[PDB]
Symmetry: C2
Subunit: 255 residues, 2 copies
């Protein structure tokens, strides 16, 4: 039922990473890339991450998959840095189980040393739900990750529960607006209100804000006018395999 086929997946080389660029609106430059895990099974097609990551969390294999993801993402960043894009950031999502695994600080610190990555070049994305299960342990691990040189961002912001007390207290550097609000920006005006509110909440707390799911130039124009710092989504590029994002990044940085 693929909850059984998931187990062979990494062994069968059925998992891979795709990469989505992130654009800074101060200079409209590509400044970061988000690594996204895919499972393309030869019989079933792509299996949604929202399906199989819960599966991996329940059978205790998510930490081993996450180790593989982090290694491949850090290696890919080192390759891109060596090609001249040495200010590029790499962002990697951490599932809730990973976030609360006490070996996560060691795994990340190892990779930052092994690939000799600059400070502030790896960003770890966590969700509001991940933080809420056990804010005590999450805070300890996030502080340790920041101490090792990683940045921390909150993914899918606005879809979970957050405490403003903890948002300012934690070592959080960036808020990512959930794409559900950005995608329907120009249509629903409660969605636009929440987009504007998240932007201003990031500004009020001294955090960068990135809009996910930017599909159209008119959406980009609206969020830039309201003060958003960065963007991600189809307007810039869908998620791409590494070889194709290398071409996109060289083309984007050419001029």
């Amino acid at each position: 039922e693929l909850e059984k086929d998931l187990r062979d997946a990494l062994q069968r080389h059925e998992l891979h990473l795709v990469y989505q660029p992130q654009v800074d609106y101060r200079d409209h430059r590509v400044v970061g890339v988000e690594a996204l895990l895919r499972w393309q099974h030869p019989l079933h097609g792509f299996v949604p991450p929202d399906l199989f990551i819960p599966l991996a969390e329940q059978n205790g294999s998510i930490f081993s998959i996450g180790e593989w993801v982090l290694d491949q993402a850090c290696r890919q960043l080192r390759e891109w840095h060596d090609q001249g894009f040495d200010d590029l950031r790499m962002a990697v999502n951490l599932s809730t189980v990973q976030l609360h695994h006490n070996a996560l600080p060691r795994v990340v610190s190892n990779l930052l040393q092994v690939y000799r990555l600059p400070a502030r070049s790896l960003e770890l994305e966590v969700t509001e739900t991940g933080l809420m299960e056990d804010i005590s342990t999450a805070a300890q691990h996030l502080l340790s990750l920041r101490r090792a040189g990683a940045l921390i961002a909150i993914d899918d912001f606005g879809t979970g529960y957050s405490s403003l007390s903890y948002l300012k207290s934690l070592p959080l550097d960036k808020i990512k607006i959930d794409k559900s609000f950005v995608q329907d920006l120009l249509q629903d005006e409660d969605d636009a209100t929440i987009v504007r509110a998240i932007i201003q909440l990031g500004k009020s707390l001294g955090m960068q804000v990135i809009a996910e799911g930017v599909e159209t130039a008119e959406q980009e124009a609206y969020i830039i006018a309201e003060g958003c710092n960065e963007g991600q989504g189809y307007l810039y590029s869908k998620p791409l395999p590494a070889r194709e994002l290398t071409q996109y990044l060289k083309q984007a940085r050419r001029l």
Copy 2:
């Protein structure tokens, strides 16, 4: 013995209300009053509400106590309206267990009609913790309360967990900055950041913002500059018994 004593505090008339005024910064005029429950035990003295309301929620006394508070508060609003303070609003705190009780909409609607109170004159204060206890039930009770003519405010904001999604979709009118962030305002700069953020979150979402715990004129100047709409705290008045708050209202509207 404390939980035991609270079981019958209400027949023993050991509960009373005090009232704290609220000031609108658009014209620096008293626009509302918060009713606050007190329990002065004959042997123990004042028992903190943070102590006896969780006790009332476990032992089931909260329902009858809460109904008594709303009744006394609506009665006092009717008296002040008839004394010429026609537009005054009354604010009452609802505990989590109260907020999720099936009979809460009928209790509030009864009192609004019994005391012939105008629409938007009673404001019910709920906490983020109360909303997150069961967002489905909370949402339908809040919609019924608003449908009956009550206003809804989130009390102690910033100290619990909220969702921007639900803040916008619920029938909320007002956010109350938690007193702990305002008391630390001028000396502590991270709480100044939280205060600024809450005020701006309120503007962004189209909700009024009231600061609780305002103690000095410099704090008030800071929060108005930031866009705060209302204030409450020792700077205006500490909580007062009804006869002194009447004196306070009369003194101002001279």
